[PDB]
Ligand binder design. Sequence first.
Ligand SMILES: [Mg+2]
Ligand SMILES: [Mg+2]
Ligand SMILES: [Mg+2]
Ligand SMILES: [Mg+2]
Length: 755
Amino acid sequence: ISADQVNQIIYNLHHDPFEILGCHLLEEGKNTKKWVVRAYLPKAEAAWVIRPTERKEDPMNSVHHPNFFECIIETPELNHYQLKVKEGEHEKVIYDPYAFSSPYLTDEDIYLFSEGNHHRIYEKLGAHVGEINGVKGVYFAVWAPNARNVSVIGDFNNWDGREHQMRKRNYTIWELFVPEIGSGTVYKYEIKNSEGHIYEKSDPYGFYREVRPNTASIVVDIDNIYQWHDEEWLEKRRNSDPLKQPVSVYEVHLGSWLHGSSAEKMPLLNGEADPVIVSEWNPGARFLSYYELAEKLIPYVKDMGYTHIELLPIAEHPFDGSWGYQVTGFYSPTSRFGRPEDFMYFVDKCHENGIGVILDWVPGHFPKDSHGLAYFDGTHLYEHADPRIGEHKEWGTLVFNYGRHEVRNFLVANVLFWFDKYHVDGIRVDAVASMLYRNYLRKEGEWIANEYGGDEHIEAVSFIREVNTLLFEYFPGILSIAEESTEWEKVSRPVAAGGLGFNLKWDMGWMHDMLDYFNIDPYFRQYHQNNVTFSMLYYYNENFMLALSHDEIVHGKSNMLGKMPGDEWQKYANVRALFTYMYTHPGKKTMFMSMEFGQWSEWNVWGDLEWHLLQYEPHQQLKQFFTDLNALYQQEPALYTHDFEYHGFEWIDCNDNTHSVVSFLRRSDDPNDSLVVVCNFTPQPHSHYRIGVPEAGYYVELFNSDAKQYGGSNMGNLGGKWADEWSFHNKPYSLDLCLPPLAVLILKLDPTKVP
Ligand SMILES: [Mg+2]
Ligand SMILES: [Mg+2]
Ligand SMILES: [Mg+2]
Ligand SMILES: [Mg+2]
């Protein structure tokens, strides 16, 4: 490029910067092409072009001006890239602001979508504010290849689409530009199918939706509604390995954490709306907005000390009682809690407080509701036509045709969408087995095998691998968490190693072992010592997340206290011992709202949590317990640097079944960060109990779950204990401990202590 062209850009004299900025073809070779990407990045000193799907990165060079950059790249196609931009000591990664010169679908967009590889399809499908032929308006586009006709109906034409019939492009996608309407427009698509039947559909790629049970889509100017402040969070994430950090997740169902009064409006970020009543049977209650949740949930979490919030599915869903797991509006955060920019504000405020956001994401199925994706164009479009692979009959839902390119693309791009537009830090996928098996919840003679005779759902395995390949290329540093309940192998291993590409898997066997164990009367736990220790046998086959989830405190299973035997003191003590063990056992941690304050009743998705319990000392003490435990977890490297290496854990003794006592070490990089953990899972105290330790010296009692401030009896070692030169458990030194009842101790060598 010339200096004159540069200067035109720098001084805002150029007639159309898209002519120069963005990605432009320079030449075509025999087997490749030469491209330039240009960027004007005021205040940046350096920039790179990332091609995350090829795992490449090329520096950009300043050209004529220190803030004007170019990068020449040879490759057959340059569809997928990001700009990494350094301003002083800080780096951000963004999509190219000049990527798309027009709001309409190009030939190239259509080709990539036809092939299943348009990672940014949601920039063109759906509804977008823009300009065509000189006039501002909204561009609508929808995939419906077998429809006979499609029209845009909405507020702007009183729901009569005769003058807003769409144009079909390439036998596949319908479009229309509507001048002089903007964000806030309410609409649907009116489709006529091959039989002549006329019906109404919400926008599959819609960005916002009326409040259930209404279903019209609403136009959002998604790139001009919110100003983020989380660049430093996003930089640290991208440059860190979350597997080597503390990860303690507070799992939350937004609709049922806390309710407000329906006698007032729902406040929004700089605005308000009518209240959304929780149900017809509880009409005095409304949901809190994303905005109110930012102001209330986030400081609550921060003070408790969790590193992450995990949300039950926030994608738009018609029935509260599905908990969000039957989604019909995959590209919009539920309108129960306000607008897209209110959820953006929630995430930005998490990041300001140093808290990450994990979304439960639901690619496995979708419900039959007629506004949604089902039978979209008068054919089996999103779902597979064969009910043996396209329906989950026991659930009454439909299963995506993962082999069909445009369906694969809908979902792959949807996962990316949440990380792009809403800056989330992770996803969690429930019931991964439901996708992986062609015989899932199907009787003999009612499913068919794959092309090799097996039960593996090949197309679904390929989709999962593609999702996780792409996610980590575009957004390194994120969490991709699976729950897979059939011992499918290598769930949390890289795709190139034959895995499914997740980086963490819920340890469901661990969860069952613990909750079954703790539910046993303590005298009988001697017959089930193996529940305590067994999960360490397979532990290194995956990267495990230790999750005690929402699913465990519903349907007659009781809340945590209710699972435990004994009198009220012992029930609390059991909860503290279980969770101290959980936080000291190798693996990352997840627990569900209400567990941290000892709610007695099961989680009820139709009400809110029993916050009044925190008026009382025992609940307050348990909450302080969790606060201190989260703090300890973040403060002790041996609890998080080596979760997934043999070095990070070793049993000291796990053979005393007759007293339900086990002990173990956790280690990190520094040998002085080693921790000694001792568990007593009966109510019998022990005044002298010997445990082998690896070094001489004074072992401080760093944590004790029987402390009086946690509701315990305050038994313990009065600060700590000198090791004896007295070999035990095959170690040269040993501690003569007092073990409190139904309690866990954590001890740590203070090598500077005065003898
Ligand atoms: Mg009509
Ligand atoms: Mg399940
Ligand atoms: Mg057993
Ligand atoms: Mg309530």
